[model samples]
Target: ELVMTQTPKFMSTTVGDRVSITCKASQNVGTPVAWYQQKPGQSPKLLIYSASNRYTGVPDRFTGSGSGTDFTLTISNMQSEDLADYFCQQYSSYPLTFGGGTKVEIKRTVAAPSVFIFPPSDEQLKSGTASVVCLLNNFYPREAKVQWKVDNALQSGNSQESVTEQDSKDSTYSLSSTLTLSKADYEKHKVYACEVTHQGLSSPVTKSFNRGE
Candidate 1:
């Protein structure tokens, strides 16, 4: 039997969010695998089988699809009751093997990250030596990724402050960062982008130069 492993061995998210779980096989084990969902007190329930089809009585939002060795299980419009452990197994061999289960928990309050770029002001514009600030703010879960880009490439050193704060009004957290660039890079069509990624984000979020016009 081939060995199976799962990525992101644990997950935490909100209802209405989509979650993806992956299973990797030791070899090309054909297409004879099944996914199971297990609650704390109940036995395992089948969710997907044969790569891409839903198992009996499975919800329409549960999707399973893969080929060869890379398999994916996605749950759409998550429900509170879906908070449980998930496992993937291959049934094609003499001794079946299963992936280490993934535990899903409810953390429904995460807020998305926001990005902004402060460009050079009129006086700094002509100086050819001004800097730019890329700000990320009002995000939850306190985990994020930031990116810096230039027209092509150059030798520029950038530092960011990743201090996190908890709001007194609610349970959300906030943070900020800045990126500085030379004034020479902000002419006509020069582009500067600030990109951020977090679990709260459906996908990576980016904000570029503004009416800082």
Candidate 2:
């Protein structure tokens, strides 16, 4: 089986700085090689291919070089939004091979969300049902997990979480989750916590509020 391995498995850089990542193959791979970039919550993107050419729509700052068993991907000028994982792939073998990956950690402050709570409407209360909403506003990276809790009990309401929109103006994302419950359940529970797990955060952020208070 053919093998592909990446160099310096991890990299730390900053905006305006230049960087280079490398990949080496167990055997000659010719030029059927490709480089891909992957952000936290997005699919991998083709950046360069065939050894030295940038893929269609790729920025000029990204360059690919080398052939046979060795190859390199270089970033001429870094940007804050360029923080991602990079991979090298070779299709010259019967079965394709890809390097583990090189993660680029760009130093920058991560933006957090401003959370808000919305109690169930009067109509919902009259129907003996309630839908408590947790709003997460203006966060970065777009990678996050939301969890729900009722009083002291963890609730499996992950299916209720949704990413409403992405604000292009500042590259932040918005998310919200609605915990459906019976009016009796919500009223008696007293406290509800909307917990968020984010890659940009050191610890989970939780916003708890008392029902009707």
Candidate 3:
């Protein structure tokens, strides 16, 4: 399967800022590319099709160009309403695929997220299974990465489901990432850590729980 890679995982901009997102294909896919815009909780809307042709109802400020293995999506006069995710898909060959996608955000008052970890309750642990959750609260821009570590090693096979919700009143985002394991495994591990990565912070936040027996 051909892969479509997009540059600069994130683009932080302000009103009136002009931005260009680049998409490169694994091979020469030519001008058969299409671009789409997606806002939170909404379906993706086509912006440009057949490379540089604008789709109906798309604003003039949105433009597309390039052919072969390279492509570009340019947004002029960036607006608050334009804060969304953009993707590029190629139909020039089989096994069609889309780029990793780019997030377009407008610069605004930023807030750093606060991290916390919740361990399984006594009743839950009695069943021979335990679940741990890492919670991040009150962050701006809604972009975050999380990882669970046990005894300072990268832990795998633990289910981690992450979801972020926005606070309509304050316009901040919060979410939780969960990790599940057997009661015996959890007790065997002397330490557990939750690492959170957010753009607003200069470094990743680490919150460790030491069993201290």
Candidate 4:
């Protein structure tokens, strides 16, 4: 993945403030760009595409405008529903790149917020056996480390999985890791965490899930 960063120490405003973020590519991305939104405790959602076109089903208020080496992601009328981290992605090359991420904090400033992982909920639990999936989502250069933790202790023996670009034109990619643990592991009502580390940025990114049974 290519290195992507954001500016302005922080961005703050009341419930309805217009916010915009700029994403630059290490190399020219050739015009096809994508945007995503990540909330405090939910998975990232796709927002814009091809630099300006809104992805189907995305809210009208969230829009993307820009092209080539530089691009802008704008939220027309910011609402409580719009607060979160915004990231930019380039679909034009082999090693996909993403913006460091601009967060819409409770208050706005330019400082980067501490990266965090939010644990999952009980509804995600299931039958006796438990399975947790850790997704690194988008990273440049296609290199990263993802680990699984159970009940505060680290679990070992994880296998790496890979995905080929389904469509070469789009240069799309995907990968994931699945961890299975004995039913006894769930008795403690343990929490599972996914930690991702890479050289592209200052620190690691994480997300966690709870045993549901």
Quick one: best lDDT, which candidate?
Answer: 3
Query: lDDT per residue, candidate 4, 55-129, as tens digits?
Result: 788988877877658788887676655667778888798677777787664332222222244333344444455
- Top TM-score hit: 2
Worst 10 residues of 3 by lDDT: 162-171
User: What C-alpha lDDT values do all the predictions have?
Assistant: 0.74, 0.81, 0.85, 0.63
In candidate 3, position 78 carries an lDDT of: 81
Looking at candidate 4, what is the lDDT of residue 136?
Answer: 49
In model 1, the Cα lDDT at residue 17 comes to 91
Report model 2's TM-score to 2 decimal places: 0.62
lDDT of 3: 0.85
- Candidate 3 per-residue lDDT over residues 111-162, each given as its tens digit: 8899998877789888899888889998887888888898989777785665
Candidate 3 or 1, higher TM-score: 3
True-vs-predicted CA distance for residue 30, candidate 4, Å: 2.3
lDDT of 1 by residue, 1-213 (tens): 688888779887677899999999998768898999997677999889997888778999899888899998999998867878899988878688888999876564767866777765678767665566766666667677777665534324664656443443343555566665565545534666667788888887777654443
The reply for model 3, stretches above 4 Å from the true place, is 109-213
Q: Residue 66 in candidate 3 has what lDDT?
A: 93
Query: Sort by TM-score, best first: what order?
Result: 2, 3, 1, 4
Q: After superposition, how far is residue 14 of candidate 4 from its true place, in Å?
A: 1.8
TM-score each candidate. Answer: 0.51, 0.62, 0.55, 0.48
